[PDB]
Amino acid sequence: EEKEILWNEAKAFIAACYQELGKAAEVKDRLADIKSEIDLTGSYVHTKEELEHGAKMAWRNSNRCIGRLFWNSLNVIDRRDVRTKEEVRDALFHHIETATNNGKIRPTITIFPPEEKGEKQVEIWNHQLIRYAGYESDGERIGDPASCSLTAACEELGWRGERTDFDLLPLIFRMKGDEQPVWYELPRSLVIEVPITHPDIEAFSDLELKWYGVPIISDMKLEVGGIHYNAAPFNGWYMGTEIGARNLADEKRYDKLKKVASVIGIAADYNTDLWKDQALVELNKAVLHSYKKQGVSIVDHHTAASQFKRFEEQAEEAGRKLTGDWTWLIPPISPAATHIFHRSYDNSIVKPNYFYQDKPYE
Amino acid sequence: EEKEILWNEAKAFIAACYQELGKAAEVKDRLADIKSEIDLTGSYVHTKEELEHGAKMAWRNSNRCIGRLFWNSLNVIDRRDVRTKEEVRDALFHHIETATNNGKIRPTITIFPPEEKGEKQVEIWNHQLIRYAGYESDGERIGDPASCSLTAACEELGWRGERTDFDLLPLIFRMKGDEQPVWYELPRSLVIEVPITHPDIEAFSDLELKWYGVPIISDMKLEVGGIHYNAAPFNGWYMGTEIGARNLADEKRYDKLKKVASVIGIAADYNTDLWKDQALVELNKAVLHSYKKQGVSIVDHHTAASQFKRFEEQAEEAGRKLTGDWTWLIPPISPAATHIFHRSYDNSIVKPNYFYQDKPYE
Numbered sequence A, B: 001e002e003k004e005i006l007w008n009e010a011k012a013f014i015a016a017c018y019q020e021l022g023k024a025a026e027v028k029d030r031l032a033d034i035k036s037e038i039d040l041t042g043s044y045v046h047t048k049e050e051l052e053h054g055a056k057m058a059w060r061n062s063n064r065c066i067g068r069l070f071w072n073s074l075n076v077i078d079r080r081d082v083r084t085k086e087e088v089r090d091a092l093f094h095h096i097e098t099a100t101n102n103g104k105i106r107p108t109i110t111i112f113p114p115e116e117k118g119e120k121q122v123e124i125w126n127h128q129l130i131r132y133a134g135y136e137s138d139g140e141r142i143g144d145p146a147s148c149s150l151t152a153a154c155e156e157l158g159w160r161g162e163r164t165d166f167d168l169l170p171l172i173f174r175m176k177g178d179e180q181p182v183w184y185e186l187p188r189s190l191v192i193e194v195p196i197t198h199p200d201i202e203a204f205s206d207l208e209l210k211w212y213g214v215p216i217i218s219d220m221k222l223e224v225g226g227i228h229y230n231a232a233p234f235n236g237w238y239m240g241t242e243i244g245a246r247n248l249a250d251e252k253r254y255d256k257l258k259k260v261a262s263v264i265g266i267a268a269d270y271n272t273d274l275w276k277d278q279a280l281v282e283l284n285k286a287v288l289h290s291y292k293k294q295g296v297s298i299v300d301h302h303t304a305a306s307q308f309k310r311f312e313e314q315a316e317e318a319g320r321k322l323t324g325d326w327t328w329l330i331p332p333i334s335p336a337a338t339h340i341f342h343r344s345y346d347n348s349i350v351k352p353n354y355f356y357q358d359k360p361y362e
């Protein structure tokens, strides 16, 4: 039933993929080849074309993603050839450099060897390739609370952060055969960071806020035709609200709203003053401003929702069913000002797709 | 099966109601009485206590309502005795006066005779007892687009609005036996309206915005123990976002954001300026300010979400399952600043409850 589930997923994927690629006549022989390859080996190997299209389909099927208009221009890097921790490290370094592209961010995914029989070849521990550490000692919070457990796991392994609010975590991953992961400090020249300033409130820089340029999600599994690529980091560019309404604003993250309110000169005393809302708007304005000023790609939530409307229209024109998760697609500020808020979406799960998987630590 | 569905709903309601009222021992004889009453008459009549508690339970079970902490203090007015259109009119007038309470709004419901065998005794046409008319002729929009079809139905019946942006619709309802509804102009002395001003932007009054004080929803059906009270208008006080983020801001309603942006002195040209968000905040601030200044009850969304957290805690302490509709409970501005956004709710439907029903017009 191992070979059964795989074979069925393979048939459905190959058929759909080859149809979209205008290759429907080659389906028969390809499925024949695959059938034999599974019988003899227990698995099968995607061609470069199948893998690239599979990764693109997986993005197109990501219900929670508002950024999907651009699914077809995903830059897919095939690293199924890596065998060593130095190769993995260098592939991760290269991904960062090529995705960053001097600030003109390229949506990119790097695909490592897939699981064999549930056995991981490479297991990445980072949630994102670039992220800030988090600490707590003596009721003092430092850095990003969302990184607290990974940060403690790294320091167990001999890493030590400087305990600033913005320490970059090391890359950390484990190779098949090894009992422990290894870690590598990120070279600073690879990492673009953006200091947060406001277009017309000069005091805003007193907050000394910054964020990194590129979100490179590295803990999701790509599934394509029954093959499980558990290590396949990918990135887009940020939507400003991710930084301004969540990373910097959530009480369980950097919790900056009261400080923002103070620098923009409003009281943080009464709910009816809507000071949190006002602070959120000014922080989100500062975030868009700062990325644009530095020449780092970013999208605001209005522009993103307009793009998503086009994605919806493109889906209809192509005869493809659209799936989405309304609770994730709506932006966390002014959601009712977007068309998303005013319609519903089918939250069905279609494969290929990206999936959560269990953390190797904690 | 008519009497069957009713009998079953009655047993479930009476049991639950009497348990909460500490009257569990009287359940047996009450169900006996009810059994006979159904057999002989086809229906049964709620006592004053059952009706009042039923209406309160129905509010407590309203998944979409963030205002539910105060479910137990609902003021229930029993008007099952009305037989004439003048009595219905006067009950509706009285509801407005007593709910308004000079601006210190009392959550109130007035309950009219229930459907007999699906036959309505009274059929209210208004969506809310107080609402503004809407018109369109020659591509000119006037007033509230959401009222366009009711407004046209009223004018078909001899009503004529002055075609201001804020014409009050007449009360309109139909009595069993009558082919056509009747309408009655609302006496102005009954209706509190609030002009919208901003606490520190003087030009804001140039918009000449206003809204009415009390939302009195009049087109939902109350169901309690199998009895269908299709005419049972009820009100709370507004949450400010209903007015500022939806009624005055939605493009399909008053569509005021571009005008707000202009009076607060910002450009409405670039999505990255977040001018819609900023305009929304200033409009919502103006709305809270204006109601408070006039002495009309209103709640901001932060305070409302804090109350709802207490409702959740009260539900747990009472051993009652909580139900909610996340997509409706989140406020349309800064939803991620409320605890609601960060948890999930079971959207199961529990009776007693309030339900949508078919419009009698259009």
Ligand code: HEM
Pocket (backbone or CB within 6 Å): A055, A058, A059, A062, A064, A065, A066, A067, A068, A070, A074, A107, A108, A109, A234, A235, A236, A237, A238, A239, A242, A299, A304, A328, A354
């Ligand atoms: C190109 C720019 C992109 C933008 C602006 C964008 C925007 C977003 C946003 C705002 C979220 C919600 C994140 C959160 O609230 O935690 C999201 C979720 C997601 N995006 Fe995209 N995205 C982009 C590119 C990509 C790419 C390249 C992929 C993969 C090929 C991808 C796959 C996903 C997935 C899988 C999720 C959901 C993750 C989860 O369940 O937690 N996106 N996207």
Ligand code: HEM
Pocket (backbone or CB within 6 Å): B055, B058, B059, B062, B064, B065, B066, B067, B068, B070, B074, B107, B108, B109, B234, B235, B236, B237, B238, B239, B242, B299, B304, B328, B354
């Ligand atoms: C006391 C102040 C109250 C506040 C602040 C409040 C708040 C709200 C809000 C903001 C909504 C969403 C409305 C929308 O987006 O269209 C809502 C929905 C609702 N409320 Fe309340 N509410 C209150 C009192 C009441 C009362 C007294 C009842 C009935 C006894 C009630 C029953 C409901 C119902 C049934 C809905 C959902 C209607 C639908 O499905 O469209 N509420 N409430």
Ligand SMILES: CN(C)Cc1ccc(OCc2ccc3ccc(N)nc3c2)cc1
Pocket (backbone or CB within 6 Å): A067, A127, A215, A217, A219, A220, A235, A236, A237, A238, A239, A242
């Ligand atoms: C918080 N973790 C434990 C769960 C978790 C894992 C992946 C997640 O991905 C979010 C995500 C994924 C892809 C994105 C692509 C672009 C973008 N701007 N944000 C993006 C955000 C989110 C949460």
Ligand SMILES: CN(C)Cc1ccc(OCc2ccc3ccc(N)nc3c2)cc1
Pocket (backbone or CB within 6 Å): B067, B127, B215, B217, B219, B220, B235, B236, B237, B238, B239, B242
């Ligand atoms: C738009 N109609 C066609 C459907 C419709 C019917 C009743 C509706 O009730 C909304 C509602 C109900 C009760 C409320 C109580 C208090 C409050 N502040 N808003 C409240 C808002 C909403 C939509």
Ligand SMILES: C[C@H](O)[C@H](O)[C@H]1CNc2nc(N)[nH]c(=O)c2N1
Pocket (backbone or CB within 6 Å): A327, A328, A329, A330, B326, B341, B342, B343, B344
């Ligand atoms: C439980 C709750 O629904 C959940 O935390 C969601 C809500 N919607 C969201 N939407 C986005 N884009 N991102 C999130 O992290 C969340 N959190």
Ligand SMILES: C[C@H](O)[C@H](O)[C@H]1CNc2nc(N)[nH]c(=O)c2N1
Pocket (backbone or CB within 6 Å): A326, A341, A342, A343, A344, B327, B328, B329, B330
């Ligand atoms: C289709 C869409 O989900 C729907 O229009 C909802 C979204 N959530 C909402 N929430 C509230 N409180 N009120 C509304 O009118 C809506 N509209």
Ligand SMILES: [Cl-]
Pocket (backbone or CB within 6 Å): A215, A242, A247
């Ligand atoms: Cl992030």
Ligand SMILES: [Cl-]
Pocket (backbone or CB within 6 Å): B215, B242, B247
């Ligand atoms: Cl309203």
